[PDB]
Design an enzyme around this catalytic site. Structure first.
Site, short mmCIF file in Angstrom:
data_model
loop_
_atom_site.label_atom_id
_atom_site.label_comp_id
_atom_site.label_asym_id
_atom_site.label_seq_id
_atom_site.Cartn_x
_atom_site.Cartn_y
_atom_site.Cartn_z
CB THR A 1 -0.99 0.09 1.24
OG1 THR A 1 -1.57 -1.49 1.31
CG2 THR A 1 -2.20 1.20 1.11
CB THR A 2 2.21 3.74 -1.80
OG1 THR A 2 2.84 2.14 -1.40
CG2 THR A 2 2.92 4.62 -1.50
#
EC number: 3.4.25.1
Lengths: 202, 233, 211, 241, 237, 204, 228, 220, 212
Positions: A1-2
């Site tokens: 995730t980012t």
């Protein structure tokens, strides 16, 4: 995730990736990590998906019910504090790492972070997720006061791309959203639209 | 009724308590006096038939070796506070390793008088007050003491008290026959003659119960033969 | 962990018409020192006194409970509390927390109802007994033998049984605490003494070794 | 009416909850507690009668500081009003603890009115007997004045006259311009009003209470200084005759 | 009998005298209201009585926004109308949270009436005195009008009126539906306003009336500020 | 484990218009015989039977509760129960104690009192019934049963052949398990008569 | 909350509130139910009298399961409660036994509820008596339930305003040999016998229970049936 | 163990296998997985095989109640919400992986649910042990806006590729199609493998098993 | 399990007043994530506080103390809170919450100036409470307390400037020999007038030792 969020004069910009993972296998490669909370307020999920979805749904319910009475568009501090309490009362059972962003008529665009503990800080820009460690140095050397809209858009896109190459738990499509007074505008980047950097070869 | 229990009248006085105090005057007569060397307590028994051995009629009990008590009115509701008294005395001896005074006992016992209400009142509680008059007695750190009680939580120290139906005649005849330096013999003789005066029967040698408490000995309830030597006069 | 070791020793002595309670005034934790001014002796009445050592946070909230219970007894019974009653109350107060207990070693000192001296020793669970001298704390092992010898006359032959006095006991406890500081680390930096006699209470403070 | 007035859970034939009329009949026997709002804040003019002068100056206070930015002026029973003040304090503290900013006024009025109206239905309780007024001022919004009756109604006003002299006092506020003049040149009007309305034969004496909120106090609700109360009283005493 | 008029119980004839008494509590305020439905629009009209010049006009209003696409107007015993409104709001939000989509009108009116019924069974409480009119737009049946009651009985309507002049207004509205015609936007407002102008004989003013509309092109509850009420009142002038 | 603390085994087979259910007979504690007349098959109405295997305590408890419920069922509405409803009842009863369950594995076998056709079911610790048309087993020695039955059970069989094949399978199976055996019992259900039999086995 | 019964015995042993609730129901809407050889039919009347009154908005013959339905003859709001409660009792039955609940058990469970409101605190009896239909085990069933909690297994009954005249007229116009169409005709005839006005394809609603399931009749078929 | 679901032009297609194993011993060879939620909604479910049955029954009951009260066809969002909340309430102690799908007034809809309360709205999804090969087949041979007789073949291939390649799944293949005017529920759609023929018998005689006792009970 | 933590806090008392110092960093493990947050507050005109450890529990205590003071400043009675009462309340809260095995990972330092008398407290997660003219939490107890002690043992009467400079010096040393610090620290004071806070500051530094 980012996930990444940036603030400019009359609004804000968001950015996220499109991958979900349950080990070394990819269960989804298009997931949407931008969840609206009101007409002009958004969120950005990280960590477990179940907890994030539940928290966001409950906050949306509470905020709609609180706004329908006062007869006034809500604020961002309100939603951020609701998130803070919900994630602090259950800090031994949750893993959320959330970000909030939006617009309101009193103050302009606003950004806040809310990590797993249950804190609440506002900042000129914010980032989160596992692939953020790999870009803590890029946002620092490029940010500058006085940025316009398109600048923030391409900045977020580039940072996301640079985080999605070295990390294995992130990648896919790049989703963007621009918020302002007039209204919201969404956008999606893929394939030849994403930036590219030449690989080093001896 | 249509008036509730926790109500006031147009005189500042509750109703149920004013009604229960009107019952004490339907009970037997009890007497208690103090001296510089001991306290005496006496009570009458109103038997109804030559049967019903009066050995079972017990109206003077032992709260502890240095504390006794005498009751009048409704003898039924009386055997609910005596267990509380014994409980508190033993709990005190257990926690502090000493003896409970008389004032503390009477205060703890009277704190339970006005606990009653037709509503929740912590269910398992009282729906009405106790109709009983109590007279304590015993020795403690400061000489012999004596107290009194009423069904409203208004206890008061005294030195010569008399309750029952005819509580006036036994007081107007007790104000003049007392002095601060009387002994036990004349005390008991005066108590017995005034009981004779107010008794309804011929004052048999078993129609009454008696007890004394002085520093040396503990709570000692007299026998049938001892009650003979004294009645010879 | 819910416990800590703060160090501290205590000493108490009785006589015919007096009692003495001595202690240190130092608070440490680990290999470092928090402060050099934290006494242990505490006054409850004009004729009784207490001493506590062990975990601080536990020795700081018990004193308040005892003070409150003393006030409530005085309000209910219309008289002050003696020494034996204090001890009988503290036993139950400690035994209440049996499966989650304190970590404090208490010692009580004062005058008997007759006018004589009394010292009561306790344990963190609530077992007490009356004695003539005790040295509960971190340095008990060093002090108990010397007190045995110099107040009971054990392992001595043809030695009289003279009584004890006030000045003698004061000098004795002073020399003892002076001695125990050169071998124990949790002890030093001060010394405090509280004397209780038929005319009230006196307090004294004395300098010691720093290290 | 035979027994239609013994409970708050009974409609009379024409349709009426008599126990609430009977309650509000209590505020028609108390002193007048008017208050107004011009342009930048609110101003209350409560009057507390003098009885058993052995008391101090400042007993039976009828002006509470419900919160850092709102003020209350009551009329009727003091005990019930104090309870309602505690209620409002708790409401405004919880609101801030949950959201994170000073509560507005409309929501406070509505919540407290719900609480007051909860007692107009069942038979296990007694309708309140107090009718009060709330006042506040903010920078985002402006000046806000309200009022509550024992039934649970909340309306916004420019001027109110709770008390036994509900009439003959509102009129004295009409002639004034309760929207133009600033919050400094109205204390005199309020004072002369409550002075000329007072009856001098049916009552022995009284004392005058005040309050202030607006831009001068930076939104904070505080008492009115004495240096200006002096000139206010002088103005009133000179204007009466 | 005996306690048949003080609580919710049956008389020898089966009537609930308490609810009958409460029906008369709507006529205390002295107000009225009407509501009609057309081809693609729903409309509501109410009175506005403000006798004191010292009172803030923009705080007295019987119209409320239960939720977007839905609207209400109340009548009688204002003190309880806000309670009923709060209940409606909470129910709608809880439904949208539980079932994912918006709650229609019929469902909401039915729920409110279900709640208003137990008060006619239990004795420790009394029935509220108020009449609630509701309007909404559903994508299947089009516009929808509805009305609850203090007894719990609801029903669907095409047009109606409530308050003091109920029967005298229905007797007049019944004479217009007998001739089915096309009512898009300008034929509903005129009729609803003439109803009042004829029952009251007022020759209304653009601040003595409150209007609430919802149409297909814009299914959001509106209030019709004076700027448009003046135009719609001069239209039929 | 704890299921194998006692031992046991039961099986069920279908026929043309008949059905069969068989079980072992033994009670012991983990290496030691105590008795040989233990009961694992119980009637649940005429033309319907149920067998259990595992911890004795739990089979007893389950049978008692099941009769407690079934009697009330038949008493309220007057009619014998059908097998599907019994299966669902048992599944609910087992799932109620999802946490702190009963260690048992029932097997149901019977007919339909309207059209006398067969029915067999095999539940598990909690549920997941297995409504089949060939056979079912339950116990500790399950592999042996699945290996013996599969070879046998021609699709159609008469009572005699059915008894024969089920007996042979059960016998040659429990003779390969140590904590189960010491006897065998078999029940055969038809339209108008029921047959009960015991076998000649090795008591070792 | 009050904790004491409002329904009590009089010197004549009669519970009065029950008689009063029954007098109430006896002044409501007329309704009829018939059980033929094939299945069951239920009919009622729309007592309302007005023009606006959108009719495709509320019903009185709502269903329960695929093969069960109800109709009332008392007061409305106390009917939806029982609808909502039966719709849950049936689901409990199904969840436990995975078989649709029959009628003779649903009626029992519903009377068990309509009774406990006769000796419980603070509440009063219902003011509605129900007529319910069903089809199970190749057998149609029709039942009536009264506010006292007693269920009657009936045959071509009628309740409401003129239940007496309806009963006297129906006692001589029914036999256990007809099909369903004759039942429709007799039901409409009984409804019209006590009518006040002019019948039409909107003043009445109808429901049928047959080998398939429960079903309410659209406003078109009742029109054709209206012709004789 | 080899669920799969896909969306096409005018509806939804859904498929699964027909095998169940208690450990490493085949207990059943024809078990049903495609469950009925509403006349226009079907839910296929893997997992612990009871936690998924009870959940489905409960949700179907509640949906029937909602439909009877409202008066129109249910939707998919309601079922998704119900399952999400009921599973999140248990912190994952309910193994109820599902591929719920159906059609409503709006277009088709396909969701995937996990035991914690996470959901997705993909156009084609799989699940169970054997999901990887099926997903591979999808990623290779999938297209948008396909018809019925193409999606059916696609799903069948995707299932067969998970049958012949996983030890935990193999049997007859099921199927289900849902459009606005059709609810084809094909069981079985095809049989890939079968038992082999026997090359002898065992002589199941009569009277070759000893007996010790006997009892008879006559009936009426 | 604390995630975002704070490092050491300093406090020293001069003549007629007290001074406190604290850096600005919400370190997550070994990462410098947040770098412009304040760990010092202002309860009232005669009391100020500082915290170490977890930052969320600090916010909780901040909120509760603020609401308490507000509830006090409404009635109007001439009374108010003094540092002693705050200290006692904090100690009791920590003890009661620890006795339930749900502690607050924080370490509190309290200043103040009452009528002519100063105050300087210490509170821990377990309820350990005491007073002194100087103290420090975390590594500040090994690298800072010694200097302060050595300076007081020869001069127990200190002026404002002396305390300020000594504080700066100890902060410099902490920045040198500590691994979870930063060159942005606030320095707060409380005199007879009131409380005051100095903005973000930085210390002087030398690295010539690196040439050997």
């Amino acid at each position: 995730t980012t996930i990444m969020a940036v603030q400019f004069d009359g609004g804000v910009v968001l950015g996220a990736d499109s991958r979900t993972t349950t080990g070394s296998y990819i269960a989804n490669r298009v997931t949407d990590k931008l969840t609206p909370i009101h007409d002009r307020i958004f969120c950005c999920r990280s960590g477990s998906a179940a907890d994030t979805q539940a928290v966001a749904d409950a906050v949306t319910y509470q905020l709609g019910f609180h706004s329908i009475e006062l007869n006034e568009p809500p604020l961002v501090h309100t939603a951020a504090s609701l998130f803070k309490e919900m994630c602090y009362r259950y800090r031994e059972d949750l893993m959320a790492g959330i970000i909030i962003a939006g617009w309101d008529p009193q103050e302009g665009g606003q950004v806040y972070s809310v990590p797993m503990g249950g804190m609440m800080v506002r900042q000129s820009f914010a980032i989160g997720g596992s692939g953020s460690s790999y870009i803590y140095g890029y946002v620092d050397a490029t940010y500058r006061e006085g940025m316009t809209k398109e600048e923030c858009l391409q900045f977020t896109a580039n940072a996301l791309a640079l985080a999605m190459e070295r990390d294995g738990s992130s990648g896919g499509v790049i989703r963007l959203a621009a918020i302002a007074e007039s209204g919201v505008e969404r956008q999606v980047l893929l394939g030849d639209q994403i930036p590219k950097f030449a690989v080093a070869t001896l | 009724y249509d008036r509730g229990v926790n109500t006031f009248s147009p005189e500042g006085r509750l109703f149920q308590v004013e009604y229960d105090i009107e019952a004490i005057k339907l009970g037997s007569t009890a007497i208690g006096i103090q001296t510089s060397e001991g306290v005496c307590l006496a009570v009458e028994k109103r038997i109804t038939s030559p049967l019903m051995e009066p050995s079972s009629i017990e109206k003077i009990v032992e709260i502890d070796a240095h504390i006794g008590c005498a009751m009048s009115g409704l003898i039924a509701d009386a055997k609910t506070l005596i267990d509380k008294a014994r409980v508190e005395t033993q709990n005190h001896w257990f926690t502090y390793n000493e003896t409970m005074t008389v004032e503390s006992v009477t205060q703890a016992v009277s704190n339970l008088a006005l606990q009653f209400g037709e509503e929740d009142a912590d269910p398992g509680a009282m729906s009405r007050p106790f109709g009983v008059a109590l007279l304590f007695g015993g020795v403690d750190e400061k000489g012999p003491q004596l107290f009194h009680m009423d069904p409203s939580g208004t206890f008061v120290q005294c030195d010569a008290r008399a309750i029952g139906s005819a509580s006036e005649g036994a007081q107007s005849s007790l104000q003049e026959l007392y002095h601060k330096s009387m002994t036990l013999k004349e005390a008991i003789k005066s108590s017995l003659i005034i009981l004779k005066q107010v008794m309804e029967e011929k004052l048999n040698a078993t129609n009454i119960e008696l007890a004394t408490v002085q520093p040396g000995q503990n709570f000692h309830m007299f026998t049938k033969e001892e009650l003979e030597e004294v009645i010879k006069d | 962990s819910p416990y800590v070791f703060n160090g501290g020793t205590i000493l108490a002595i009785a006589g015919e018409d007096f009692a003495i309670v001595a202690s240190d005034t130092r608070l440490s934790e680990g290999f470092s020192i928090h402060t050099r001014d934290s006494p242990k002796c505490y006054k409850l009445t004009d004729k009784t006194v207490i001493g506590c050592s062990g975990f601080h946070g536990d020795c700081l909230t018990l004193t308040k409970i005892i003070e409150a219970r003393l006030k409530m007894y005085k309000h209910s019974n219309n008289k002050a509390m003696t020494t034996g009653a204090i001890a009988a109350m503290l036993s139950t107060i400690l035994y209440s927390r049996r499966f989650f207990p304190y970590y404090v070693y208490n010692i009580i000192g004062g005058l008997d109802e007759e006018g004589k001296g009394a010292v009561y020793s306790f344990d963190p669970v609530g077992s007490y007994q009356r004695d003539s001298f005790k040295a509960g704390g971190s340095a008990s092992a060093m002090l108990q033998p010397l007190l045995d010898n110099q107040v009971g006359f054990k392992n001595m032959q043809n030695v009289e049984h003279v009584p004890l006095s006030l000045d003698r006991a004061m000098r004795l406890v002073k020399d003892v605490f002076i001695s125990a500081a050169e071998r124990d680390v949790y002890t030093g930096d001060a010394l405090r003494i509280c004397i209780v006699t038929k005319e009230g209470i006196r307090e004294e403070t004395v300098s010691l070794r720093k290290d | 009416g035979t027994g239609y007035d013994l409970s708050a859970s009974t409609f009379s034939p024409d349709g009426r909850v008599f126990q609430v009329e009977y309650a509000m009949k209590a505020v028609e026997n108390s002193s007048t507690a008017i208050g107004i709002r011009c342009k930048d804040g609110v101003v209350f003019g409560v009057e507390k009668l003098v009885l058993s002068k052995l008391y101090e100056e400042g007993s039976n206070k009828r002006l509470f500081n419900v919160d850092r930015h709102v003020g209350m002026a009551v009329a009727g029973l003091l005990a019930d009003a104090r309870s309602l003040a505690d209620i409002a304090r708790e409401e405004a503290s919880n609101f801030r603890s949950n959201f994170g900013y000073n509560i507005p006024l409309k929501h406070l009025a509505d919540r407290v009115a719900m609480y007051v109206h909860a007692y107009t239905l069942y038979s296990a309780v007694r309708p309140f007997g107090c009718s009060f007024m709330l006042g506040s001022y903010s920078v985002n919004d402006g000046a806000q004045l309200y009022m509550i009756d024992p039934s649970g109604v909340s309306y916004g006003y420019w001027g109110c006259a709770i008390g036994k002299a509900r009439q003959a006092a509102k009129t004295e506020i009409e002639k004034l311009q309760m929207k133009e003049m600033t919050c400094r040149d109205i204390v005199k009007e309020v004072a002369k009003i409550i002075y000329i309305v007072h009856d001098e034969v049916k009552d022995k004496a009284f004392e005058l209470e005040l309050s202030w909120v607006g831009e001068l106090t930076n939104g904070r609700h505080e008492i009115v200084p004495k240096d200006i109360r002096e000139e206010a009283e002088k103005y009133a005493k000179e204007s009466l005759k | 009998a005996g306690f048949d008029r003080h609580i919710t119980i049956f008389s020898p004839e089966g009537r609930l005298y308490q609810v009958e008494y409460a029906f008369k509590a709507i006529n205390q305020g002295g107000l009225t209201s009407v509501a009609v439905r057309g081809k693609d629009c729903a409309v509501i009209v109410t009175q506005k009585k403000v006798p004191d010049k010292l009172l803030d006009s923009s705080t007295v209003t019987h119209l409320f926004k239960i939720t977007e696409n839905i609207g209400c107007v109340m009548t009688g015993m204002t003190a309880d109308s806000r309670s009923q409104v709060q209940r409606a709001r909470y129910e709608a939000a809880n439904w949208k949270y539980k079932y994912g989509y918006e709650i229609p009108v019929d469902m909401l009116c039915k729920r409110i009436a279900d709640i208003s019924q137990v008060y006619t069974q239990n004795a420790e409480m009394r029935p509220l005195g108020c009449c609630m009119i509701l309007i909404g737009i559903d994508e299947e049946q089009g516009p929808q009008v509805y009305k609850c009651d203090p007894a719990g009985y609801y029903c669907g309507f095409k047009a109606t009126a409530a308050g003091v002049k109920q029967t005298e207004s229905t007797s007049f509205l019944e004479k217009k539906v007998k001739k089915k015609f096309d009512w898009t936007f300008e034929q509903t407002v005129e009729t609803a306003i003439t109803c009042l102008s004829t029952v009251l004989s007022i020759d209304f003013k653009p601040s003595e009336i409150e209007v609430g509309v919802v149409t297909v092109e814009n299914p959001k509850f509106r209030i019709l500020t004076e700027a448009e009420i003046d135009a719609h009142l001069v239209a039929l002038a | 484990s704890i299921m194998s603390y006692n031992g046991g085994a039961v099986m069920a087979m279908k026929g043309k218009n008949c059905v069969a259910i068989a079980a072992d007979r033994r009670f012991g504690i983990q290496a030691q015989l105590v008795t040989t007349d233990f009961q694992k098959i119980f009637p649940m109405g005429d033309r319907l039977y149920i067998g259990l295997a595992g911890l004795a305590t739990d089979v007893q408890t389950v049978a008692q509760r099941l009769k407690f419920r079934l009697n009330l069922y038949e008493l309220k509405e007057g009619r014998q129960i059908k097998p599907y409803t019994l299966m669902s009842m048992v599944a609910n009863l087992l799932y109620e104690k999802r946490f702190g369950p009963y260690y048992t594995e029932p097997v149901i076998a019977g007919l339909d009192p309207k059209t006398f056709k067969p029915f067999i079911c095999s539940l598990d610790l909690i549920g997941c019934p297995m409504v089949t048309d060939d056979f079912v087993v339950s116990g500790t020695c399950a592999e042996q049963m699945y290996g013996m039955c599969e070879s046998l059970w021609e699709p159609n069989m008469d009572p005699d052949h059915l008894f024969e094949t089920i007996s042979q399978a059960m016998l040659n199976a429990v003779d390969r398990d140590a904590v189960s055996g010491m006897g065998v019992i078999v029940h055969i259900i038809e339209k108008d008569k029921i047959t009960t039999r015991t076998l000649k086995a090795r008591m070792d | 909350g009050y904790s004491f019964s409002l329904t009590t015995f009089s010197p004549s042993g009669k519970l009065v509130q029950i008689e009063y609730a029954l007098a109430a129901v006896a002044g409501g809407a007329p309704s009829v139910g018939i059980k033929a050889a094939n299945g069951v039919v239920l009919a009622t009347e729309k007592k309302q009298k007005s023009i606006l009154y959108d009719e495709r908005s509320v019903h009185k013959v709502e269903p329960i399961t695929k093969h069960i339905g109800l109709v009332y003859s008392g007061m409305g709001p106390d009917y939806r409660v029982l609808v909502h409660r039966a719709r849950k009792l049936a689901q409990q039955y199904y969840l436990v036994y995975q078989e649709p609940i029959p009628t003779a058990q649903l009626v029992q469970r519903v009377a068990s509820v309509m009774q406990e409101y006769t000796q419980s605190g603070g509440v009063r009896p219902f003011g509605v008596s129900l007529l319910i239909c069903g089809w199970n085990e190749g057998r149609p069933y029709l039942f009536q339930s009264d506010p006292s909690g007693a269920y009657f297994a009936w045959k071509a009954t009628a309740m409401g305003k003129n239940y007496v005249n309806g009963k006297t007229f129906l006692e001589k116009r029914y036999n256990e040999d007809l099909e369903l169409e004759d039942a429709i005709h007799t039901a409409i005839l009984t409804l019209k016998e006590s009518f006040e006005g002019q019948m039409t394809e909107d003043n009445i609603e109808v429901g049928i229970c047959n080998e398939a399931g429960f079903r309410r009749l659209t406003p078109t078929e009742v029109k054709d049936y209206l012709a004789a | 163990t080899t669920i799969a679901g896909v969306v096409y032009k005018d509806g939804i297609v859904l498929g699964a296998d027909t095998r169940a194993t208690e450990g490493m011993v085949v207990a059943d060879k024809n078990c049903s997985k495609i469950h009925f939620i509403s006349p226009n909604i079907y839910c296929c479910g893997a997992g612990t095989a009871a936690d998924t049955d009870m959940t489905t029954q409960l949700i179907s009951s509640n949906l029937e109640l909602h439909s009877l009260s409202t008066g129109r066809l249910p939707r998919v969002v309601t079922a998704n919400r119900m399952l999400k909340q009921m599973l999140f309430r248990y912190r994952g102690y309910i193994g109820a992986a599902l591929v719920l799908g159906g059609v409503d007034v709006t277009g088709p809809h396909l969701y995937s649910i996990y035991p914690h309360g996470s959901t997705d709205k993909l156009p084609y999804v799989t699940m169970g042990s054997g999901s990887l090969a099926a997903m591979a087949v999808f990623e290779d041979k999938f297209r948008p806006d396909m018809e019925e007789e193409e999606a059916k073949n696609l799903v069948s291939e995707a299932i067969a590729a998970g049958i012949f390649n996983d030890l935990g799944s193999g049997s007859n293949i099921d199927l289900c199609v849902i459009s606005k005017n059709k609810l084809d529920f094909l069981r079985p759609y095809t049989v890939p493998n079968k038992k082999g023929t026997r090359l002898g018998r065992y002589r199941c005689e009569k009277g070759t098993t000893a007996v010790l006792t006997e009892k008879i009970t006559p009936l009426e | 399990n604390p995630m975002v933590t704070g490092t050491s806090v300093l406090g020293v008392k001069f003549e007629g007043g007290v001074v406190i110092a604290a850096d600005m960093l919400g370190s997550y493990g070994s990462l410098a994530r947040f770098r412009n947050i304040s760990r010092i507050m202002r309860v009232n005109n005669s009391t100020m506080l500082g915290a170490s450890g977890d930052y969320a529990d600090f916010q909780y205590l901040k909120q509760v103390l603020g609401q308490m003071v507000i509830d006090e400043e409404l009635l109007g009675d001439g009374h108010s809170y003094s540092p002693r009462a705050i200290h006692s309340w904090l100690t009791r809260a920590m003890y009661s919450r620890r006795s339930k095995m749900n502690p607050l990972w924080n370490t509190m330092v309290i200043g103040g100036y009452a009528d002519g008398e100063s105050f300087l407290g210490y509170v821990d997660m377990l309820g350990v409470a005491y007073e002194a003219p100087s103290l420090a939490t975390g590594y500040g107890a090994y690298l800072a307390q010694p200097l302060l002690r050595e300076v007081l043992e020869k001069q127990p009467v200190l002026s404002q400037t002396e305390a300020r400079d000594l504080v700066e010096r100890c902060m410099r040393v902490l920045y040198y020999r500590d691994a979870r610090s930063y060159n942005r620290f606030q320095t707060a004071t409380v005199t007879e007038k009131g409380v005051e806070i100095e903005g973000p500051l930085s210390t002087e530094t030398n690295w010539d030792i690196a040439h050997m």
